[PDB]
Swiss-Prot record:
Origin species: Gallus gallus (Chicken)
Keyword Disulfide bond on entry: yes
Disulfide bond sites: 6-127, 30-115, 64-80, 76-94
Protein's recorded name: Lysozyme C
Binding annotation for substrate: 101
Functional summary from the UniProt entry: Lysozymes have primarily a bacteriolytic function; those in tissues and body fluids are associated with the monocyte-macrophage system and enhance the activity of immunoagents. Has bacteriolytic activity against M.luteus.
Main location: secreted
Length: 129
């Protein structure tokens, strides 16, 4: 599913992300924009052979099981394919663990390079929330 901007903001909000660990909703929307272009089915292979899955491009090295990432963990206790669903529940729950792990949203390299220090509120501008 390719989400609309405001549609993802609303779904993120409903699943408890707005100010989760101090990150306003615009942070999450911006991160999803540059990670996946709001497309739940986005996948990208990393140099180490791990793969990133879903709207927030959650990685198989640490966070989900794809059966093909030697020596990885599955800290969200989910198949990586659950991160591709039109239902973003699994992505959201897993992101909450990720963002709690000490580095905050800096865990998302694209958030750090494209969202951090920017006017992220612009991403929810005009949305009915």
């Amino acid at each position: 599913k390719v989400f609309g901007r405001c549609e993802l903001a609303a779904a993120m909000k409903r699943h408890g992300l707005d100010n989760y660990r101090g990150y306003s909703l615009g942070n999450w929307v911006c991160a999803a924009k540059f990670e996946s272009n709001f497309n739940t089915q986005a996948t990208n292979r990393n140099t180490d052979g791990s793969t990133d899955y879903g709207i927030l491009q959650i990685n198989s090295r640490w966070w989900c099981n794809d059966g093909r990432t030697p020596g990885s963990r599955n800290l969200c206790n989910i198949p990586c394919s659950a991160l591709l669903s039109s239902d973003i529940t699994a992505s959201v729950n897993c992101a909450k663990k990720i963002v709690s792990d000490g580095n905050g949203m800096n865990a998302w390299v694209a958030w750090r390079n494209r969202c951090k220090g920017t006017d992220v509120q612009a991403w929810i501008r005009g949305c009915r929330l």
